Amino acid sequence: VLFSTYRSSRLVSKEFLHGPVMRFRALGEYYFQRAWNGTLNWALPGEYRLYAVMIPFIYFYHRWHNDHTLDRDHVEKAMIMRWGGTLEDVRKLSAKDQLRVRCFTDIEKLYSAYGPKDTYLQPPGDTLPGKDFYR
Amino acid sequence: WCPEVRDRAELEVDITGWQWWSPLEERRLLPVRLRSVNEVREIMSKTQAKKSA
Amino acid sequence: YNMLVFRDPKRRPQLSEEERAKVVVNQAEWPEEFKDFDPDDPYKNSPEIIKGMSSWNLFLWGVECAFIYQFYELVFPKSI
Amino acid sequence: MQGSWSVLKKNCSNFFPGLLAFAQQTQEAYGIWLRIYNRQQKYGPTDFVEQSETFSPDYHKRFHSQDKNMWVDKELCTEVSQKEVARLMTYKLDMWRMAHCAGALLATGGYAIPFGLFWLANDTWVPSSFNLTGEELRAWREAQDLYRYRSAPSYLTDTKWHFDFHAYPWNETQERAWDDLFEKNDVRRDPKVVRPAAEMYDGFIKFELIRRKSLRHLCRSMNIPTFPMLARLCNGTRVRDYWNLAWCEDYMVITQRLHESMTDEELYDYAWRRYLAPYDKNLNREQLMERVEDYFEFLGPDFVAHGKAPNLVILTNYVLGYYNDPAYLEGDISELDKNDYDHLASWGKDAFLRRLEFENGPLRDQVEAHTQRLLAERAAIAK
Amino acid sequence: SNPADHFRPNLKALTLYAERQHYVDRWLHVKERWLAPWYLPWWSPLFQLGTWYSQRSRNLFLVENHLSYRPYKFRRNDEDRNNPY
Amino acid sequence: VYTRWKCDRLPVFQLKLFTQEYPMHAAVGIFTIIFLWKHMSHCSEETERKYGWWAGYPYWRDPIARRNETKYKQMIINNDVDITHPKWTGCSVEQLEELSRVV
Amino acid sequence: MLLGGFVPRRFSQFNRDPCWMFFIFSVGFWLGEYPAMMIKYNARDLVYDPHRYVWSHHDDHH
Amino acid sequence: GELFVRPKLEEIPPADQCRGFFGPLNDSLKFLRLLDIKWMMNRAVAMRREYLIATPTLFTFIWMFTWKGAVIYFWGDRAPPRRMDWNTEETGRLPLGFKPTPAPL
Amino acid sequence: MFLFFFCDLFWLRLLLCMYYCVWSRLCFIVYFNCLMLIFDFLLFCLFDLYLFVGLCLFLLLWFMLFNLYSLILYYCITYLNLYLLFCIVFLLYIAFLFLFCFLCDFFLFNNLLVGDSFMDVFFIRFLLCFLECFSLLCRCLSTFLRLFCNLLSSHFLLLMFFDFFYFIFVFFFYGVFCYWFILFIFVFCFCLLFYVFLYLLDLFAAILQLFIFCNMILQLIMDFLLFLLFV
Amino acid sequence: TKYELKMQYFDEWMIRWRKFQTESDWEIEKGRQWWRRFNMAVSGALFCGLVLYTSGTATLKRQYGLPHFFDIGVDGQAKETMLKTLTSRWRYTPQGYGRVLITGVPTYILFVTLEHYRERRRMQQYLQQNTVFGEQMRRLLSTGKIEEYLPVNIKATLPASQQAIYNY
Numbered sequence A: 001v002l003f004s005t006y007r008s009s010r011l012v013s014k015e016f017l018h019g020p021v022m023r024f025r026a027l028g029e030y031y032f033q034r035a036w037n038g039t040l041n042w043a044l045p046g047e048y049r050l051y052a053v054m055i056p057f058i059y060f061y062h063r064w065h066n067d068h069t070l071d072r073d074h075v076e077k078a079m080i081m082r083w084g085g086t087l088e089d090v091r092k093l094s095a096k097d098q099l100r101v102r103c104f105t106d107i108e109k110l111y112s113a114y115g116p117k118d119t120y121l122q123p124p125g126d127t128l129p130g131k132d133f134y135r
Numbered sequence B: 001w002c003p004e005v006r007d008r009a010e011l012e013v014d015i016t017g018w019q020w021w022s023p024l025e026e027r028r029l030l031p032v033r034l035r036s037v038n039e040v041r042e043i044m045s046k047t048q049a050k051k052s053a
Numbered sequence C: 001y002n003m004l005v006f007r008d009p010k011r012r013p014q015l016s017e018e019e020r021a022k023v024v025v026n027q028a029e030w031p032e033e034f035k036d037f038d039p040d041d042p043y044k045n046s047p048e049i050i051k052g053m054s055s056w057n058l059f060l061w062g063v064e065c066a067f068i069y070q071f072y073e074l075v076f077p078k079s080i
Numbered sequence D: 001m002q003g004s005w006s007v008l009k010k011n012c013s014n015f016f017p018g019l020l021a022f023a024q025q026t027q028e029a030y031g032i033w034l035r036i037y038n039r040q041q042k043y044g045p046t047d048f049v050e051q052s053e054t055f056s057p058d059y060h061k062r063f064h065s066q067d068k069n070m071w072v073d074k075e076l077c078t079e080v081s082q083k084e085v086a087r088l089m090t091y092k093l094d095m096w097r098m099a100h101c102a103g104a105l106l107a108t109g110g111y112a113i114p115f116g117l118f119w120l121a122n123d124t125w126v127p128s129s130f131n132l133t134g135e136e137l138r139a140w141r142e143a144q145d146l147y148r149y150r151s152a153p154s155y156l157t158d159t160k161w162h163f164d165f166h167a168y169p170w171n172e173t174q175e176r177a178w179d180d181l182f183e184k185n186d187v188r189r190d191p192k193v194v195r196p197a198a199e200m201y202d203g204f205i206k207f208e209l210i211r212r213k214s215l216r217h218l219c220r221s222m223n224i225p226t227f228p229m230l231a232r233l234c235n236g237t238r239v240r241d242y243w244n245l246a247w248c249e250d251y252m253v254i255t256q257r258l259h260e261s262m263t264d265e266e267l268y269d270y271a272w273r274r275y276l277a278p279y280d281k282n283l284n285r286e287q288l289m290e291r292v293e294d295y296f297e298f299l300g301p302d303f304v305a306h307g308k309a310p311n312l313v314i315l316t317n318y319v320l321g322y323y324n325d326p327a328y329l330e331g332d333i334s335e336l337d338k339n340d341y342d343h344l345a346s347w348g349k350d351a352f353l354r355r356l357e358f359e360n361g362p363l364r365d366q367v368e369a370h371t372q373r374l375l376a377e378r379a380a381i382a383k
Numbered sequence E: 001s002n003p004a005d006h007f008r009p010n011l012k013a014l015t016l017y018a019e020r021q022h023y024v025d026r027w028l029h030v031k032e033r034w035l036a037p038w039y040l041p042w043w044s045p046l047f048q049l050g051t052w053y054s055q056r057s058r059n060l061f062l063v064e065n066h067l068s069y070r071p072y073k074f075r076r077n078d079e080d081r082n083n084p085y
Numbered sequence F: 001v002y003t004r005w006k007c008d009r010l011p012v013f014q015l016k017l018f019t020q021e022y023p024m025h026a027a028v029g030i031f032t033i034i035f036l037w038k039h040m041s042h043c044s045e046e047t048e049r050k051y052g053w054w055a056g057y058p059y060w061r062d063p064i065a066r067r068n069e070t071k072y073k074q075m076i077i078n079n080d081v082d083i084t085h086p087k088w089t090g091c092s093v094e095q096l097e098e099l100s101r102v103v
Numbered sequence G: 001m002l003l004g005g006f007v008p009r010r011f012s013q014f015n016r017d018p019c020w021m022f023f024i025f026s027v028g029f030w031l032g033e034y035p036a037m038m039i040k041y042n043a044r045d046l047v048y049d050p051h052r053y054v055w056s057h058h059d060d061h062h
Numbered sequence H: 001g002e003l004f005v006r007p008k009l010e011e012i013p014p015a016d017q018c019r020g021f022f023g024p025l026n027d028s029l030k031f032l033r034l035l036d037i038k039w040m041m042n043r044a045v046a047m048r049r050e051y052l053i054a055t056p057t058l059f060t061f062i063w064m065f066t067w068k069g070a071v072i073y074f075w076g077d078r079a080p081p082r083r084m085d086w087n088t089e090e091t092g093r094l095p096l097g098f099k100p101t102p103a104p105l
Numbered sequence I: 001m002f003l004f005f006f007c008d009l010f011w012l013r014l015l016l017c018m019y020y021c022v023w024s025r026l027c028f029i030v031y032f033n034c035l036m037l038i039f040d041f042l043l044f045c046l047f048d049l050y051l052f053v054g055l056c057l058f059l060l061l062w063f064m065l066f067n068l069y070s071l072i073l074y075y076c077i078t079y080l081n082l083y084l085l086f087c088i089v090f091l092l093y094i095a096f097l098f099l100f101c102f103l104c105d106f107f108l109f110n111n112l113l114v115g116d117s118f119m120d121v122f123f124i125r126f127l128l129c130f131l132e133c134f135s136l137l138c139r140c141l142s143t144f145l146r147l148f149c150n151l152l153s154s155h156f157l158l159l160m161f162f163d164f165f166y167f168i169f170v171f172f173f174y175g176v177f178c179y180w181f182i183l184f185i186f187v188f189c190f191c192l193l194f195y196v197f198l199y200l201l202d203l204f205a206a207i208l209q210l211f212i213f214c215n216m217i218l219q220l221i222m223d224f225l226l227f228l229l230f231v
Numbered sequence J: 001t002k003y004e005l006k007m008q009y010f011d012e013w014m015i016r017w018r019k020f021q022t023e024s025d026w027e028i029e030k031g032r033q034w035w036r037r038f039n040m041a042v043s044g045a046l047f048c049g050l051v052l053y054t055s056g057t058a059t060l061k062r063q064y065g066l067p068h069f070f071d072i073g074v075d076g077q078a079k080e081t082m083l084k085t086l087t088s089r090w091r092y093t094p095q096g097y098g099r100v101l102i103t104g105v106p107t108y109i110l111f112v113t114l115e116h117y118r119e120r121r122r123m124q125q126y127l128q129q130n131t132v133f134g135e136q137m138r139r140l141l142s143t144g145k146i147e148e149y150l151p152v153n154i155k156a157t158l159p160a161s162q163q164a165i166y167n168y
């Protein structure tokens, strides 16, 4: 009595936002409602252009998120640990120095398991600071 | 504008009848077709003979 | 033909050879887009979406976007 | 039927008088049922009295058998009259719904009150005794008929689809019977033509093998409460009891030809309890008599000869076919002159669509000939 | 290691902590508030559903007499195998 | 004609689907959810330090310590707890004053 | 399911459809980010961090 | 696989034909049929009541795979230690001079 | 502890809303066998043998939205945890098993006692019965483990190969201008071939593993189904 | 009276402060467990009896008729005796919801009543205890709130090697 269990109990008029809805449906139907767009379990459509458009967009937004939210944490951790262990110590550097450090971190990422191991293993006799430099 | 088909399909799906093929019913109804005039004459002759008997 | 894994669909013939030979071709009635139609290159005469915008131009645009993405910090670095 | 404030007020006003009437009907129906039960226990067959066990051949699950666990008391007229049987059936329905409501109340304590408010706002599940005037009774009957309309088509479609997808009729007569059994109520079905479907379905599924979902649909169509459904052998027992009483009354009427002497309103009620005559159809005595005679003919001579009715599943489908209204179609034919995809017109045709139109348009033959000739020339050049 | 780190959810937003005692007590208060009113008799199925299983579990816990030691469920450090405390 | 999926609203259809179509599955799902929240809903501080942070635990600021400090301060202030009570310290107030004067 | 759709015959036709225009732009981005990385990460003036041995992920995860 | 039909009363072999671990438990040994598990298994197989052997097993597995498995894993008692910390039964009692509150009345 | 996160399907949810506001036929189904259980006509089952269709379709859709799109770089399989897959398979498998057990038909388990009367009951038939009742739970565990590990291994391999490709492409492309350009060209062609092969293999295996994930459940269902013959 | 709502807090506190559980309280809990098991057994016996009484005549004949699994002779005698006893008099053999109600409602009522009264008995027992748990129970019933850390407030007895904390 309070709420209807049937979908037929309309809450708005039939013409409410008719124009925008029709434009949205026009966008949806032009490429999808076609004979050659035979989906495989609703997930893989048959239209080539759908792949061509969506794959780049998905990759772009995922990569942007990864670069500006996920890898940034590792980069900041490296900068903090290698240059004082505190955020203020890093901020004491100039923008150019931070750029140099971040690009070295990118170098390490690109090297990974096939790059030279001198990037993280200090050769004996090296004059550069060790692990106990800030301790 | 074809209500019978709509209702039957919706009801079949709503009662767990997902399949969209009915080979048995089609086999029963596949050869159905309107008869020729000669076939009608033969059937009418058969019916007349049956009624006379 | 193919472009990577994308294959161009081909219409199956419907007319028999006898019927086909009796067909008279009149390209004058055909649209200007499809004249001297070639199944191996049906879109050779198809109009460009944007006049003067070549495929190589878009490829170079993408390359420039990548270069910007990689080099912007080198010119306008920002502090942590 | 959806709940309404007017129905809520009606039921609230008549709540206590309705309860008192229900109690009086309970006493009367207990007397009638005591008589019937004593007669069954005394003169009933050994199998019926001992409740012989019938198990399904696949999972060996017990269920009532139509032949053994159902018995028609041909000599019940001596002890119990037809009107008493009808009263007992109506009280059984009302008592079932009231028992479900009382069980909910006991289970949930005082937290069922808002659900009671929802209950009283709809006439679907209120007892008939809550109506103290003709108009209220008419509205209540309309609600019951609406529920029957809501439920029956699903049951019919379930039965028909399962059979047609898992089996086919043996002979042409069975094919005709099966096809004509599930016709819409707008047309009249000949019981003689449709009867063989009973034997066919007995070959496919008897009442002892009825599935739980189909049972739920049937109970919905018979205005029998289904929540909590529980095991299939509870609502199955309810259905068996109701149809056994109905068959006893039908045998009494057929033997004594009571329906001819039965008045208009009583005849309409008799048909309604058989799920043959909806009240919203405003049927006259001629139509009611036609439908009742069709029902009796469908029962067949064997019903009178030995008290054996046709398959209960097919019988229920046949009777409920009267609630299978033709699919609604509203709107003038002129509406077919409009267009559905005008909003896409602004988009036009892309290169692929233009190519498809060119190849499969009126010039399709010319394009096909040109393409085939070009391909043949290229192949010849290659060789 | 680095390859293994790539298999983590990438849309973590917030983390909330709550001691078992606190929210268990709050749930008990809610249950008591809803099961207290007189119009819900103790013999009703709802009240028994609410109370009996919890009572049985707590009684089983109380009766427990184990010869071994069960370290505290909510220690600060449970990653050390040689330090149950 | 009436059909659950077409005529009923979404909550009603959901209830019907998980009560008269897949009731056992819903029951098992609720059972599993209860088990998960009863036995797999705790994480010690050491576990969080080892694996609970994307790039690693920032020991240089120890956020866990600040979180616990805020928790305990809020509890003490709201509940009016006398942290100087002998049970918390194991010694009398006078002994505490003597120790403060000593150290 | 890869049933149909516009398929450019060669590079020059990628401008005959907006979707393939976006696709070729994306391919240009993809392939051109590599030369940029070559130039940037093999530059003469690029210098390794002097404190690179102060800390590394290898000691952290170990 | 295929449908199962219960054997008729006349198709069931006599009990005396059943064999135990060593031999048939005929007269003077009938009461040993209760204790011989193999004899009971053979009798059930002969009477086509094979479920008596299979139903208890499968269910048991389920009971272990669902409820007792985790109960044992999370709340089970491990092996006792060599040096055992028994209870001195000194804790709990109220101290001397304490005035307990009165009971409800 | 309560962690608030979101699945990686928001864009796909938006696309589903955009493209499926209107009806469309479905004709290609990864696991089509869930719709055709009976192949010999006149056979019918009183058990709800078509109850698995909806769950099968939803699971296929969900796992395809996750796994197939995970090939795209940086795409995350949010559900990729061993015990979470265990929970999913537990739900499905145990739900169907309890559906069969709640039927309260003990004869349904007669086939568990493998073999014939001619084999020792205690020492042969009963042991094999124990082993088979163990094999049921092992089938559940195997389904979930296979689904987890195929994905994990494939994505580990893809990440490693992509790292190698990035390394050689970035830090050794200058060899094109040097006298040893032929070696670099050969290596680059090999890497491209391997890249294509890996992508094709992953695309095929992602769909095959779903075929098999649903086939195990359907096999569980079929192991307890009995068909009657129409007469 | 609803004792469970009061007793849940006390049980949780005892679990949290189970160290101060005297052997008397442990015996009380063991007795509660034993009485729960006894209530379950009697309720099951009642349910089985109601099921047997309402069973159909054919069902009883099938269950308590030939063949005999053991065929010792005592089994057949007992089955025949029970069958004759059940089939001699008239028995109300309902089916469906009726049998469900008849078999369950008595069982549920019996089990719930026994358990509720045993809970009341346990509450009384804890009230009569002279241990810290008894004092906590009395304080809970008086003030209506559970006083945590009560054992250390009133300085409940501790082992001789653990009285240092009280040294103040």
Ligand SMILES: CCCCCCCCCCCCCCCCCC(=O)OC[C@H](COP(=O)([O-])OCC(O)COP(=O)([O-])OC[C@@H](COC(=O)CCCCCCCCCCCCCCCCC)OC(=O)CCCCCCCCCCCCCCCCC)OC(=O)CCCCCCCCCCCCCCCCC
Pocket: D026, D029, D030, D033, D095, D096, D097, D098, D099, D100, D101, D102, D103, D104, D106, D107, D228, D234, D237, D238, D241, E043, E044, E045, J094, J095, J096, J097, J098, J099, J100, J101, J102, J103, J104, J105, J106, J108, J109, J110
């Ligand atoms: C206080 C404690 C509470 C405990 C918790 C309870 C929780 C709620 C559960 C439900 C309890 C019952 C609710 C009241 C129902 C009304 C009475 C009744 O049975 O009506 C008949 C009717 C029987 O249905 P049927 O299908 O026709 O029966 C087929 C038989 O073949 C029928 O046989 P027949 O064909 O031969 O015909 C016989 C018929 C012939 O009679 C007639 O035709 C005349 C009419 C008679 C019936 C009248 C019913 C009137 C109902 C409405 C009452 C007024 C409501 C007013 C509401 C507003 C108030 C302001 O007479 C009968 O119907 C007799 C049935 C047999 C008796 C059943 C009662 C047993 C329990 C009572 C005794 C308890 C003793 C305790 C001892 C303790 C010792 C320690 O009841 C029903 O409709 C069935 C109940 C529907 C709801 C079911 C909900 C699930 C229940 C699960 C229970 C599981 C066990 C318990 C534990 C639960 C844990 C979760």
Ligand SMILES: CCCCCCCCCCCCCCCCCC(=O)OC[C@H](COP(=O)([O-])OCC(O)COP(=O)([O-])OC[C@@H](COC(=O)CCCCCCCCCCCCCCCCC)OC(=O)CCCCCCCCCCCCCCCCC)OC(=O)CCCCCCCCCCCCCCCCC
Pocket: A001, A002, A003, A004, A005, D001, D002, D003, D100, D101, D102, D104, D105, D112, D113, D115, D116, D117, D118, D119, D120, D121, D122, D124, D125, D227, F008, F011, F012, F015, F016, F019, F027
């Ligand atoms: C004084 C009176 C006299 C005395 C008392 C007498 C006795 C009375 C009691 C007995 C009455 C029985 C008859 C009742 C009939 C009416 C039933 C009914 O409800 O009909 C639908 C009824 C309308 O009926 P109708 O319009 O007449 O249509 C009937 C048709 O025939 C349509 O028919 P249909 O068949 O299509 O409808 C059926 C539908 C009925 O359902 C519905 O229609 C759904 C109703 C709810 C829809 C809610 C939609 C709105 C949601 C809003 C969400 C919140 C929004 C934001 C709010 C912000 C607020 C600030 O589906 C079902 O039946 C499904 C059944 C599901 C059963 C579930 C069983 C679970 C068992 C668990 C598993 C156990 C396994 C074993 C485990 C064993 C372990 C040992 O629905 C409503 O009226 C909706 C009411 C919505 C209220 C507002 C939203 C909820 C407010 C909650 C407030 C909470 C406050 C406290 C919060 C505390 C927080 C800490």
Ligand SMILES: CCCCCCCCCCCCCCCCCC(=O)OC[C@H](COP(=O)([O-])OCC(O)COP(=O)([O-])OC[C@@H](COC(=O)CCCCCCCCCCCCCCCCC)OC(=O)CCCCCCCCCCCCCCCCC)OC(=O)CCCCCCCCCCCCCCCCC
Pocket: D100, D101, D103, D104, D107, D108, D111, D125, D216, D225, D226, D227, D228, D229, D230, E034, E045, E046, E049, F010, F011, F014, F015, F016, F018, F019, F020, F023, F024, F026, F027
């Ligand atoms: C987009 C998101 C939207 C929002 C989503 C929200 C989230 C949902 C997520 C989860 C959804 C799925 C959950 C599934 C769970 C598993 C279900 C399952 O396994 O079911 C198997 C199975 C399926 O049922 P079925 O009998 O085969 O048929 C179900 C069909 O729906 C029958 O259909 P039908 O067409 O055949 O029948 C139609 C019609 C036919 O008409 C009738 O049957 C006549 C009228 C019957 C009235 C009821 C009679 C009841 C008799 C006694 C039943 C036994 C009681 C046992 C003792 C009490 C235990 C509590 O029946 C009705 O209209 C039924 C009306 C019921 C209305 C109540 C529905 C629930 C609405 C919410 C209210 C409670 C909110 C609590 C939480 C909030 C608190 C602040 O369940 C049963 O056997 C039923 C057992 C019911 C036992 C009682 C309920 C136990 C659960 C706890 C209750 C707590 C009450 C708290 C009160 C307030 C305290 C403050």
Ligand SMILES: CCCCCCCCCCCCCCCCCC(=O)OC[C@H](COP(=O)([O-])OCC(O)COP(=O)([O-])OC[C@@H](COC(=O)CCCCCCCCCCCCCCCCC)OC(=O)CCCCCCCCCCCCCCCCC)OC(=O)CCCCCCCCCCCCCCCCC
Pocket: E060, H059, H060, H062, H063, H066, H067, H068, H071, I098, I101, I102, I103, I104, J033, J036, J037, J038, J040, J041, J042, J043, J044, J045, J048, J049
């Ligand atoms: C139809 C179903 C279809 C679907 C099935 C779906 C499931 C699939 C199957 C596999 C299972 C999957 C598991 C899923 C999760 C389910 C939940 C779960 O696992 O929870 C376990 C979980 C176990 O407890 P726990 O917390 O894990 O740890 C154990 C604690 O001790 C807990 O402490 P507590 O206080 O709760 O104690 C509970 C107690 C169980 O219940 C009790 O509290 C005590 C026992 C109650 C007895 C009930 C009545 C028995 C029958 C009476 C007679 C009837 C006939 C009357 C006529 C007689 C005429 C002469 O259990 C025990 O600790 C064992 C007690 C042993 C007592 C006997 C001592 C041994 C010596 C005496 C016997 C041997 C004599 C031979 C001597 C030699 C001669 C030569 O909870 C329970 O289930 C226990 C509480 C509930 C007990 C209910 C009692 C009533 C049982 C009636 C059954 C009747 C039907 C069975 C036969 C059917 C034949 C056709």
Ligand SMILES: CCCCCCCCCCCCCCCCCC(=O)OC[C@H](COP(=O)([O-])OCC(O)COP(=O)([O-])OC[C@@H](COC(=O)CCCCCCCCCCCCCCCCC)OC(=O)CCCCCCCCCCCCCCCCC)OC(=O)CCCCCCCCCCCCCCCCC
Pocket: D055, D060, D061, D062, D063, D230, D231, D232, D233, D234, E045, E046, E048, E049, E052, E053, H059, H063, I104, J043, J048, J051, J094, J095, J096, J097, J099, J100, J103, J104, J105, J107, J108, J111
């Ligand atoms: C908030 C409340 C919470 C409540 C929780 C309690 C549970 C829920 C309560 C009830 C809920 C309502 C719905 C229940 C189901 C209704 C089913 C139905 O529709 O039946 C219709 C049916 C009526 O149809 P009918 O045509 O008259 O007859 C049926 C045909 O025979 C049918 O013919 P058929 O061809 O189908 O024949 C087959 C039929 C034949 O059976 C029957 O139909 C006969 C009736 C049942 C007999 C059951 C007893 C069998 C003998 C037991 C012997 C035990 C000895 C143990 C000795 C131990 C010594 C130490 O079925 C069977 O063969 C099944 C046999 C049972 C197998 C049990 C297997 C259990 C496995 C356990 C695994 C391990 C568990 C964990 C570990 C435990 C140990 C540590 O109803 C009945 O016959 C009886 C219904 C009884 C309903 C249950 C009553 C509940 C009472 C509860 C009292 C305690 C409350 C505690 C509350 C605690 C605080 C909250």
Ligand SMILES: CCCCCCCCCCCCCCCCCC(=O)OC[C@H](COP(=O)([O-])OCC[N+](C)(C)C)OC(=O)CCCCCCCCCCCCCCCCC
Pocket: E053, E057, E060, E061, F031, F032, F034, F035, F036, F038, H065, H066, H067, H068, H069, H070, H071, H074, H075, I083, I084, I086, I087, I090
């Ligand atoms: C780094 C370490 C890694 C370790 C990994 C280990 C594997 C972890 C895998 C997790 C994911 C997969 C989970 C699958 C599901 C597992 C289920 C499981 O075992 O859970 C059991 C657990 C056991 O529960 P429990 O733990 O509360 O048991 C209590 C037992 N005592 C009191 C003795 C301690 O079940 C639950 O968690 C749910 C319980 C509530 C729901 C059931 C209530 C009804 C119970 C009926 C019987 C008893 C009452 C009487 C009858 C009814 C009366 C009304």
Ligand SMILES: CCCCCCCC/C=C/CCCCCCCC(=O)OC[C@H](COP(=O)(O)OCCN)OC(=O)CCCCCCC/C=C/CCCCCCCC
Pocket: A001, A002, A003, A004, A005, A009, A010, A011
């Ligand atoms: C049931 C309330 C009893 C007490 C009276 C409270 C009156 C409060 C004042 C309300 C004024 C505004 C009313 C506007 C119309 C409301 C219409 C309505 O309820 O429709 C429900 C409608 C959905 O209907 P359908 O399911 O689509 O189909 C309905 C047909 N069966 O719900 C909505 O859209 C939400 C509308 C909310 C309106 C405000 C309701 C406020 C109720 C407050 C109750 C508590 C007491 C208030 C006392 C106030 C004293 C000054």
Ligand SMILES: CCCCCCCCCCCCO[C@@H]1O[C@H](CO)[C@@H](O[C@H]2O[C@H](CO)[C@@H](O)[C@H](O)[C@H]2O)[C@H](O)[C@H]1O
Pocket: J027, J030, J031, J032, J034, J042
């Ligand atoms: C409807 C039934 C109503 C019954 C009402 C009461 C009937 C008369 C009393 C029955 C006997 C009670 O006697 C009962 O004996 C057992 C021992 O056997 C005691 O039990 C004691 O020893 C057992 C030994 O295993 C321990 O498990 C248990 O923890 C301990 O308390 C109970 O604490 C006592 O209550």
